[PDB]
Amino acid sequence: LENGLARTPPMGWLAWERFRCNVNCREDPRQCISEMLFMEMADRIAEDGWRELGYKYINIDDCWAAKQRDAEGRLVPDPERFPRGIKALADYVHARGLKLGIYGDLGRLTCGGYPGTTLDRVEQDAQTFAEWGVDMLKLDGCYSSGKEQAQGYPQMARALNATGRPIVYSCSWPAYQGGLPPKVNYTLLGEICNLWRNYDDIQDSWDSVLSIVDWFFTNQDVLQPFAGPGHWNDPDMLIIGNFGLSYEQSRSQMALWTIMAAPLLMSTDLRTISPSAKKILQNRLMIQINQDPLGIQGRRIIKEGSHIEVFLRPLSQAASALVFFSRRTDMPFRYTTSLAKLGFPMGAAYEVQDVYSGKIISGLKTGDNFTVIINPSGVVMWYLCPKA
Amino acid sequence: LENGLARTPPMGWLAWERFRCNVNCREDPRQCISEMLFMEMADRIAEDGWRELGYKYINIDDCWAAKQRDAEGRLVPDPERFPRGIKALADYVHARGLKLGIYGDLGRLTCGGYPGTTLDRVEQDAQTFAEWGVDMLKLDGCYSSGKEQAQGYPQMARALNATGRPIVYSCSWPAYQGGLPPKVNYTLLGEICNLWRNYDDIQDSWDSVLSIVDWFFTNQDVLQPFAGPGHWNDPDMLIIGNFGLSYEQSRSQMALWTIMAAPLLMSTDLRTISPSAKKILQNRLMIQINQDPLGIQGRRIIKEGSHIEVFLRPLSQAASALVFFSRRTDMPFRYTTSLAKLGFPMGAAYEVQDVYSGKIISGLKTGDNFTVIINPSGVVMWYLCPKA
Ligand SMILES: *[C@@H]1O[C@H](CO)[C@@H](O[C@@H]2O[C@H](CO)[C@@H](O)[C@H](O)[C@H]2NC(C)=O)[C@H](O)[C@H]1NC(C)=O
Ligand SMILES: *[C@@H]1O[C@H](CO)[C@@H](O[C@@H]2O[C@H](CO)[C@@H](O)[C@H](O)[C@H]2NC(C)=O)[C@H](O)[C@H]1NC(C)=O
Ligand SMILES: CC(=O)N[C@@H]1[C@@H](O)[C@@H](O)[C@@H](CO)O[C@@H]1O
Ligand SMILES: CC(=O)N[C@@H]1[C@@H](O)[C@@H](O)[C@@H](CO)O[C@@H]1O
Ligand SMILES: *[C@@H]1O[C@H](CO)[C@@H](O)[C@H](O)[C@H]1NC(C)=O
Ligand SMILES: *[C@@H]1O[C@H](CO)[C@@H](O)[C@H](O)[C@H]1NC(C)=O
Ligand SMILES: *[C@@H]1O[C@H](CO)[C@@H](O)[C@H](O)[C@H]1NC(C)=O
Ligand SMILES: *[C@@H]1O[C@H](CO)[C@@H](O)[C@H](O)[C@H]1NC(C)=O
Numbered sequence: 001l002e003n004g005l006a007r008t009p010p011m012g013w014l015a016w017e018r019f020r021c022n023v024n025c026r027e028d029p030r031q032c033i034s035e036m037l038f039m040e041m042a043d044r045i046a047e048d049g050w051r052e053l054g055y056k057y058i059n060i061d062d063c064w065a066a067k068q069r070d071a072e073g074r075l076v077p078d079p080e081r082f083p084r085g086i087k088a089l090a091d092y093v094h095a096r097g098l099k100l101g102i103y104g105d106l107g108r109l110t111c112g113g114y115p116g117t118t119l120d121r122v123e124q125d126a127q128t129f130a131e132w133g134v135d136m137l138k139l140d141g142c143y144s145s146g147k148e149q150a151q152g153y154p155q156m157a158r159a160l161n162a163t164g165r166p167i168v169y170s171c172s173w174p175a176y177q178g179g180l181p182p183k184v185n186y187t188l189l190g191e192i193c194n195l196w197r198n199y200d201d202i203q204d205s206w207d208s209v210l211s212i213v214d215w216f217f218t219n220q221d222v223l224q225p226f227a228g229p230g231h232w233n234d235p236d237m238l239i240i241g242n243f244g245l246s247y248e249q250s251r252s253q254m255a256l257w258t259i260m261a262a263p264l265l266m267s268t269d270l271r272t273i274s275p276s277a278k279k280i281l282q283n284r285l286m287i288q289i290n291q292d293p294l295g296i297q298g299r300r301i302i303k304e305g306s307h308i309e310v311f312l313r314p315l316s317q318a319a320s321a322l323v324f325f326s327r328r329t330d331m332p333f334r335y336t337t338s339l340a341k342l343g344f345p346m347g348a349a350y351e352v353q354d355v356y357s358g359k360i361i362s363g364l365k366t367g368d369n370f371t372v373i374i375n376p377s378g379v380v381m382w383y384l385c386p387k388a
Numbered sequence: 389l390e391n392g393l394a395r396t397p398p399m400g401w402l403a404w405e406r407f408r409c410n411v412n413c414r415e416d417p418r419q420c421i422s423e424m425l426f427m428e429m430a431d432r433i434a435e436d437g438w439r440e441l442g443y444k445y446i447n448i449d450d451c452w453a454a455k456q457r458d459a460e461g462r463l464v465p466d467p468e469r470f471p472r473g474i475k476a477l478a479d480y481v482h483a484r485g486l487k488l489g490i491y492g493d494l495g496r497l498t499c500g501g502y503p504g505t506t507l508d509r510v511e512q513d514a515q516t517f518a519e520w521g522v523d524m525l526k527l528d529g530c531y532s533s534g535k536e537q538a539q540g541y542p543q544m545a546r547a548l549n550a551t552g553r554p555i556v557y558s559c560s561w562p563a564y565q566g567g568l569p570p571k572v573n574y575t576l577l578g579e580i581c582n583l584w585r586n587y588d589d590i591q592d593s594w595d596s597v598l599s600i601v602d603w604f605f606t607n608q609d610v611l612q613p614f615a616g617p618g619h620w621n622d623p624d625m626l627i628i629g630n631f632g633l634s635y636e637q638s639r640s641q642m643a644l645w646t647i648m649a650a651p652l653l654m655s656t657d658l659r660t661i662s663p664s665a666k667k668i669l670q671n672r673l674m675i676q677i678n679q680d681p682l683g684i685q686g687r688r689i690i691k692e693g694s695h696i697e698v699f700l701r702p703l704s705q706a707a708s709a710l711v712f713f714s715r716r717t718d719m720p721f722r723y724t725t726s727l728a729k730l731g732f733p734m735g736a737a738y739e740v741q742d743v744y745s746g747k748i749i750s751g752l753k754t755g756d757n758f759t760v761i762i763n764p765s766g767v768v769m770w771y772l773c774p775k776a
Contacts, residue, residue: 020719031720203717204764206594206632243636243764244594244717329591329632331408332419376592376631 012057044270059101090133101136107144130163241268248378400445447489478521489524495532518551629656636766
């Protein structure tokens with residue numbers, strides 16, 4: 001989508017995976033979906049170093065609105081959970097130099113049972129969001145037919161533009177259509193959306209992450225070519241800092257999402273996040289690679305019988321990123337190979353930096369053998385710069 | 389096995405899961421299987437508070453011996469990796485008030501390719517181990533037929549007794565025979581072994597733990613009745629502190645192994661263990677419940693459609709232990725029920741202590757509703773004492 005936005009994958013926080021549709025603010029004041037949740041996450045992003053790293057979006061997901069539109073047919077937030085309205089929430093977030101994202105559903109109902117954005121409501125809702133000061137909109141697709149979606153998604157892109165307010169547009173259209181051609185036309189998506197959810201919702205478990213990793217890389221031929229500045233593939237939220245991932249697994253998700261040029265939308269409680277989880281999510285070099293200006297999504301290039309997978313992502317400044325991933329469940333594994341074997345130019349030399357450890361290799365020749373030790377369900381990630 | 393040993397499930401450290409058959413001491417001085425590994429783990433157990441809690445066994449697993457017996461037909465440790473011999477290692481461990489465990493295989497070869505204990509070598513090997521000062525022996529079953537195992541396992545029990553040295557005897561016999569009756573006779577196992585590996589080796593992943601949990605509880609009817617002081621079911625090593633389990637998952641394994649009256653044999657690097665992992669493994673109340681004098685293995689009593697499972701273990705002093713386990717992957721879950729609904733006596737009251745948080749409930753009436761909040765892949769564990 002050529003609206004000057006999302007020239008790099010969107011970075012921020014999104015409520016869904018971690019908080020879901022919790023409306024029990026009486027017993028879960030901090031974990032329930034309310035204006036307070038977003039204001040506090042905004043303070044967290046603004047105060048704990050996240051903002052400086054690039055994390056700027058504070059996104060509201062499903063279950064924020066009243067169970068019905070007002071009499072005028074407009075969407076309104078839940079009165080008890082959002083007593084100051086959305087515009088006020090936006091100002092608050094804006095005052096911190098952050099941006100506010102909201103959620104809607106192209107259909108009769110949102111997946112959670114809240115007011116849906118039917119075709120006759122698209123222009124009005126887009127208008128309502130802009131007036132509130134919204135900066136990003138995720139449009140879900142429950143309760144709408146393929147025909148209705150084919151009309152509605154492009155229609156909402158036009159409506160958003162008409163408001164004159166630049167709004168990042170995240171589309172779930174592909175996921176509802178199976179995520180693959182011919183049913184999905186990624187060329188069209190690139191023209192109308194800034195990013196799109198291609199596949200299943202991420203759940204809080206390592207197997208969920210693996211399921212997403214495997215679907216995207218198995219189908220990379222029909223997905224990788226359509227990602228770029230202004231239009232990204234979205235494998236869903238980062239679940240680092242939550243309940244299901246071990247330390248190694250957490251680093252694995254961050255590394256693989258970076259290879260995929262995926263949005264870095266955290267869905268975790270920033271008020272209780274652990275130091276190790278924070279350290280992973282705040283890795284500057286990792287973020288630099290994810291945010292690379294060229295926006296060329298990487299690919300899996302090797303699947304060893306040793307249960308080791310290798311990924312490569314081409315970058316700006318003639319650089320590259322490599323991820324060595326172990327799916328073994330026995331012990332740290334010694335993977336030995338050479339850049340030449342991985343496909344790099346002959347007779348060259350590279351300065352290599354281990355993204356997580358910081359260790360550097362001054363001048364690795366492409367013909368030289370090297371060994372990396374990868375832990376179970378973990379990765380070793382390299383940033384490579386050619387010497388001249 | 390009535391040898392006065394293992395009146396409570398064995399507690400200690402075992403090398404296998406974490407270190408496997410690593411013999412590359414040149415590049416992995418600390419992680420390779422050598423006398424140094426065991427001496428250092430012994431120092432760890434003796435110095436970091438483990439010994440006082442009950443952890444006393446330091447067990448050697450596969451890959452410790454020379455590739456062949458000496459000329460006299462006796463087992464000898466690998467010369468380079470165990471330069472001071474086993475007896476010296478035992479003395480060292482003994483000097484710390486700990487005990488040394490060793491590994492052997494009833495067959496032509498150990499699963500790792502090391503010298504096996506064939507039938508004609510049983511008496512000699514049992515003799516060799518006693519002389520070295522061995523305190524525990526795990527007898528694997530690779531490369532032996534069912535007929536040979538039926539003869540060898542009982543035969544080794546007799547050989548060990550004859551040495552006059554009390555030796556905990558861990559038998560893998562059932563695992564090789566499928567772990568279920570009629571092929572396996574757990575009454576016989578109770579007579580000849582102190583503990584037995586009934587099922588598959590644990591690997592470093594949550595799915596491995598779940599696979600073990602599900603097999604044991606699905607088949608609890610033919611397993612639970614045969615566990616007791618002196619003879620236990622062994623679901624394998626604790627992998628808390630390693631690469632594949634998240635924090636919640638780690639607590640889940642500890643809690644479920646405690647419900648199963650399982651041996652608490654840690655297989656992790658005690659030199660680098662995290663504070664949180666250490667805190668889980670050193671939980672005194674948890675250990676007290678695992679070590680309960682009655683030795684009555686618990687059972688799964690409920691499988692909700694909410695993906696919540698409930699476990700109960702009867703204890704001494706008319707007490708009980710309950711585990712509420714969530715296999716959901718969405719968010720913390722509120723499980724509401726009553727002790728009456730769980731099956732407890734009517735019109736009674738209990739003092740309840742949350743094993744992990746320490747929070748206490750003074751006098752919970754069996755008829756009163758209560759709610760516990762369980763995190764994804766996590767547990768809530770209670771210790772209950774009746775009031776009078
Ligand atoms: C509506 O669409 C127009 C283009 O159709 C957007 O204008 C483009 O903005 C980008 C970045 O600001 C420029 O690089 C292009 O040159 C512009 N194109 C044209 C035709 O001028 C405009 O930003 C959109 N409006 C909103 C609010 O999204
Ligand atoms: C060999 O077996 C005998 C029993 O057959 C063991 O002796 C028993 O030891 C326990 C605990 O010390 C006592 O409770 C029993 O009363 C003993 N039984 C008998 C018949 O005396 C003996 O400990 C075993 N020897 C070894 C080295 O394991
Ligand atoms: C593909 C897609 O957008 N899925 C969304 C999910 O992310 C979340 O927003 C949920 C809220 O109910 O609704 C849909 O399942
Ligand atoms: C059931 C059983 O004992 N399995 C063992 C395993 O625990 C480990 O000792 C390994 C060493 O090679 O051998 C067997 O697979
Ligand atoms: C996909 O959409 C683009 C953009 O509208 C269009 O040019 C192209 O023809 C479509 N492809 C197919 C197979 O319909
Ligand atoms: C490099 O390592 C590979 C093993 O992956 C080996 O086959 C090859 O012979 C090595 N090359 C040299 C020059 O040692
Ligand atoms: C199981 O072993 C015990 C102990 O030797 C024996 O008494 C019993 O008969 C055996 N059960 C069967 C079915 O063979
Ligand atoms: C106790 O909670 C259950 C829900 O599990 C509910 O059905 C029941 O009515 C409650 N009992 C009382 C007295 O509130």
